[PDB]
């Protein structure tokens, strides 16, 4: 029915197009989907643009005309320079004609802004091609045409706005460097004429819609125009006075003055300083008389969200912060500007109370800039004492949890500066807030949490003696608050906050052992509390206090019989009895932190074996049972116990690193035996039940055991200081346990954590086990590549760990790649090029890094038969595969690393670092240098890949690229110019002489 318009044999039925378009935009369900596919195939027809003047003349549907201009746009940007010059003049004349037509009809001008703005954007695509070289009179005629009609004048401001955007704001990606400079130079050459008209309209102030459009264009000009057009005219008075009084103009005017505050200005001119002060004084004066006084509740206004109030208050925040960040020093010395300075800051205080996370971040960046300055710059704080005092309450009342890292960091930083500036005011505000929790005035779970996070944030800013009296006052008040409240819910919230604050004040805990001990014994009591969150809070607080205070747990305190670590270890069974396994692992990790502080070896190893007693006796039991009967291991309860033992070892190993060796030695042999037993059980289940077995609880349980064993070994080796023992004791048993098991399992039974583990082994001791590295390649290389070389999605973990493994092997033990049979070395090159074509950035980045490191590895070999055979076999594969991903538009994230690799490959030939001819016997004359042959190969390659480029473009691109191959940033520029030119027809070949 609708598919008629797709038949180009006949004249286009406009009425049929209009139903297709109409049932797409206003239609529904299957009809609109069918219309969508029809309209898409229509505009993608390469001849569609020919039937464009028809649609703009004869169609009455604004959506049809919009789509007709889109079809035109696609032709102008891509195929314009291929057209006969009379088609170009035709298209220009009927776009200009359509625009003046729609401007002359007030009904159409009012009612079809979408279609007019789209026409203007199309005109600007033509200017980018034709102006000013083939259209010198465009600006003089635009300026003269503006005087005839207000509507035409308004639309001309929209054209100039779009032109400014396309040349200065969005040129970098979309045009060659040369074309950008040409259009920038042309716009600034004729800007004098444009500004006069701009200023004329604004002063004469005919119509608000025309004035809003002129100010919109001015906002774009302010991104690039020289400062003199703003300072040597009356325009600052207009922006800061008459346009701030009307709400139509006020929104755009404030955005303009924000960009004025960012202009590049000479910094030694007293008259310019006074002009900068004046527009601020005028702006703030209009706010106070026309919008809201300094005292207005902006929080309530913003919350009510009437009209454009939220946008206005967002823009006022941006204006004040921008201006005061740059200029507040202009207002700090004169006594007559003191009131202006503090009113502007009082507006920011009121803005800082708005409930809007992203606005608060904007005001908080400014407060940071201010209080940082008051802390260092001399004689400045006294000015801001009332501002800072209000700010203290605003930060504290709006404190977020440390989990929100960025905001919490920003808030802590500001509150710490404000504490340095007035300790007494900070302490008073926080004690007063605490009193309002106790009397119930401001009591809430949220309110006490907020206050706790705030009090916690300013730790380490007060003197030790001031901190002592403050901490004690807060803890006693929070303890009283807890006693006063009823119900596990209320008491748990206050107990968490007590425990939170204590954890934040380690200097206090270090100075008062009796208190630290009480705190810890109380955490041990809370580890028996079943109420939701308490055990996690108790364990989190425990390891937090230990990270900071570990030294006080490992020494003997003067009134104590033993170091407290020994006391923790004796009652560890009782203390952790009620914890979930993950909580028990945290607890053990905490003990490992303390034990690492013990520097006597005998004593560290004794505490380590004392701590690992329970897991070591559970272990000795389970290996005896597991060695006697392999059936007993299949039981779920035994798999969970074993996994929890290994995880306890990972936890303690994580905090002790090198010091964990004796405990690893104690379990190592039986653990690698268990790894094999568990491997067999997994394979046996995959045999009896199929691949579905890998998803059953018990096989996932078994695989957890293998993963936690590989995690334990990875964690130790990564931190090991005695690499001789790693090689002579750990590695050979490890390679024999994991490599063959990995190779000989079906893909779905292979653990990617094997590759991860091997990566670490090669990283730390690769240099010492060259035969071990070869055994790793033989075992994981071919079978892992086969898993990941069919698509980009399957085995995502294996894919990522695979290229980390090759990366580290290519860095530390390149010898292992020289030993590969040629066929397998070819697969190694295939595998790198495979990495290039990935979107997944972890694979892509490692892909390009291996390629770069491999090239340098071959370079280092000098003139040797292997380096020579590598270049003859693989050099052009690497150049052409790098060029493929540079130019295909689907790998733009890797542009920098692609560029670097290509530069390295091209620079090899232009430094004559490749000793052999790159060409086949009788492919070229006998003498010919690699330089000349590279030029021919590249010319031919790009000619076939991009047949619409001229020989002149390709030759010029390559002359620039090869001569610029010692200067990365410029090289990149040439590559970007080439990426622009492949997108169009008739690219100027001279554009590659920009650098």
């Amino acid at each position: 029915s609708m598919e008629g318009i797709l038949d180009f044999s006949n004249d286009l039925d406009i009425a049929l197009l209009d139903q297709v378009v109409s049932t797409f935009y206003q239609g529904s369900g299957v009809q609109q989907k069918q219309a969508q596919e029809i309209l898409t195939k229509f505009q993608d027809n390469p001849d569609a643009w020919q039937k464009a003047d028809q649609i703009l003349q004869f169609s009455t549907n604004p959506q049809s005309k919009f789509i007709a201009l889109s079809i035109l746009d696609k032709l102008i940007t891509r195929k314009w320079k291929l057209l006969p010059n009379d088609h170009r003049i035709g298209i220009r004349n009927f776009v200009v004609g359509m625009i003046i037509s729609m401007c002359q009809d007030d009904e159409v001008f009012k009612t079809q802004k979408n279609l007019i703005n789209k026409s203007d954007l199309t005109l600007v695509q033509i200017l980018k091609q034709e102006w000013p070289q083939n259209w010198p009179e465009f600006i003089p005629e635009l300026i003269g045409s503006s005087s005839s009609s207000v509507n035409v004048c308004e639309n001309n401001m929209i054209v100039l706005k779009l032109l400014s955007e396309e040349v200065f704001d969005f040129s970098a990606e979309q045009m060659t460097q040369a074309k950008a400079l040409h259009l920038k130079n042309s716009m600034s050459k004729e800007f004098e004429q444009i500004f006069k008209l701009c200023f004329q309209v604004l002063e004469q102030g005919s119509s608000s819609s025309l004035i809003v459009a002129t100010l919109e264009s001015l906002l774009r000009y302010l991104h690039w125009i020289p400062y003199r057009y703003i300072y040597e005219t009356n325009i600052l008075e207009l922006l800061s006075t008459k346009f701030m009084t009307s709400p139509d103009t006020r929104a755009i005017t404030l955005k303009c003055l924000t960009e004025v505050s960012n202009l590049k200005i000479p910094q030694d001119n007293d008259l310019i300083k006074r002009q900068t002060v004046l527009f601020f004084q005028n702006t703030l004066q209009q706010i106070a008389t026309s919008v809201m006084p300094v005292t207005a509740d902006l929080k309530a206004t913003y919350a009510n969200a009437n009209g454009n109030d939220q946008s206005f208050l967002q823009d006022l925040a941006m204006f004040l912060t921008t201006y005061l960040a740059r200029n507040r020093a202009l207002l700090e010395s004169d006594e007559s500007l003191r009131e202006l300075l503090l009113n502007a800051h009082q507006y920011l205080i009121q803005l800082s109370k708005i409930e809007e996370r992203e606005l608060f971040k904007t005001t908080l960046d400014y407060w940071h800039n201010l209080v940082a300055d008051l802390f260092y710059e001399p004689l400045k704080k006294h000015i801001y004492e009332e501002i800072c005092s209000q700010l203290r309450l605003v930060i504290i009342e709006n404190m977020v949890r440390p989990e929100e890292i960025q905001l919490y960091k920003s808030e802590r930083e500001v509150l710490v500066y404000l504490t340095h500036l007035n300790v007494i005011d900070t302490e008073e505000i926080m004690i007063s807030k605490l009193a309002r929790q106790i009397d119930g005035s401001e009591w809430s779970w949220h309110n006490i949490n907020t206050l706790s996070w705030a009090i916690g944030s300013i730790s380490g800013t007060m003197s030790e003696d001031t901190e002592k009296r403050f901490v004690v006052t807060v803890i006693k008040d929070l303890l009283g608050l807890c006693e006063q409240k009823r119900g596990k819910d209320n008491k748990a919230v206050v107990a968490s906050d007590i425990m939170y604050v204590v954890g934040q004040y380690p200097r206090f805990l270090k100075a008062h052992w009796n208190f630290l001990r009480t705190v810890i014994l109380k955490l041990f009591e809370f580890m028996h509390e079943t109420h939701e969150g308490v055990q996690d809070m108790a364990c989190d607080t425990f390891i937090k206090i230990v990270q900071k205070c570990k030294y006080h747990f490992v020494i003997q305190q003067p009134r104590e019989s033993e170091p407290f670590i020994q006391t923790i270890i004796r009652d560890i069974q009782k203390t952790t009895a009620d914890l979930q396994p993950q909580q028990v692992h945290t607890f053990y990790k905490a003990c490992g932190i303390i034990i690492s502080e013990e520097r006597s070896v005998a004593e560290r190893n004794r505490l380590l074996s004392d701590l690992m007693q329970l897991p070591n006796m559970a272990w000795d039991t389970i290996v005896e049972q597991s060695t006697a009967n392999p059936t007993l291991l299949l039981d779920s309860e035994t798999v969970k116990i074993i996994a929890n033992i290994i995880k306890t070892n990972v936890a303690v190993c994580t905090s002790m690193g090198a010091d964990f060796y004796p405990q690893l030695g104690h379990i190592y042999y039986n653990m690698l035996q268990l790894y094999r037993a568990v491997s067999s059980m997994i394979s046996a289940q995959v045999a009896a039940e199929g691949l579905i077995a890998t998803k059953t609880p018990k096989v996932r349980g078994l695989r957890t055991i293998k993963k936690e064993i590989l995690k334990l070994v990875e964690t130790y080796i990564s931190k090991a200081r005695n690499l001789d023992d790693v090689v002579k004791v750990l590695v050979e048993p490890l390679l024999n346990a994991v490599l063959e098991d990995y190779m000989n399992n079906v893909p779905d039974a292979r653990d990617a954590e094997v590759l991860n583990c091997m990566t670490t082994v090669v990283e730390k001791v690769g240099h010492m086990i060259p035969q071990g590295v070869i055994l790793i390649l033989q075992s994981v290389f071919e079978c892992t590549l086969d898993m990941i070389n069919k698509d980009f999605t399957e085995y995502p973990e294996h894919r990522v760990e695979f290229y980390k493994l090759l990366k580290v092997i290519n860095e530390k033990s390149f010898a292992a790649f020289l030993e590969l049979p040629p066929a397998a070395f070819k697969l190694f090159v295939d595998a790198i090029c495979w990495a290039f074509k990935h979107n997944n950035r972890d694979v892509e980045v490692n892909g390009l890094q291996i390629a770069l490191d491999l090239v340098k590895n071959i370079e280092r070999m000098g003139n040797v038969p292997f380096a020579n055979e590598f270049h003859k076999n693989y050099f052009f594969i690497f150049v052409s595969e790098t060029f493929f991903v540079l130019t295909d538009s689907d790998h733009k994230s890797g542009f920098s690393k692609q560029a670097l690799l290509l530069m390295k490959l091209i620079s090899l030939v232009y430094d004559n670092k490749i000793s052999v001819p790159l060409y086949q016997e009788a492919e070229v004359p006998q003498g010919t240098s690699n330089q000349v042959y590279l030029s021919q190969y590249l010319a031919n390659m790009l000619s076939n890949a991009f047949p619409h480029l001229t020989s002149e473009q390709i030759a010029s691109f390559l002359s620039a690229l090869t001569k610029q191959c010692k200067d990365l940033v410029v090289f990149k520029g040439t590559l970007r110019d080439f990426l622009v030119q492949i997108k169009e027809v008739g690219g100027d070949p001279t554009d590659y002489l920009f650098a």
Binding site: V472, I475, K476, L479, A495, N514, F515, T518, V519, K522
Partner: peptide
């Protein structure tokens, strides 16, 4: 001084009991 001892005494009685 004694007030650090008063903190220790008070901290010891901290509890989470349903009422």
């Amino acid at each position: 001084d004694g007030y650090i001892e008063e903190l220790i005494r008070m901290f010891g009685k901290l509890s989470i009991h349903d009422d």
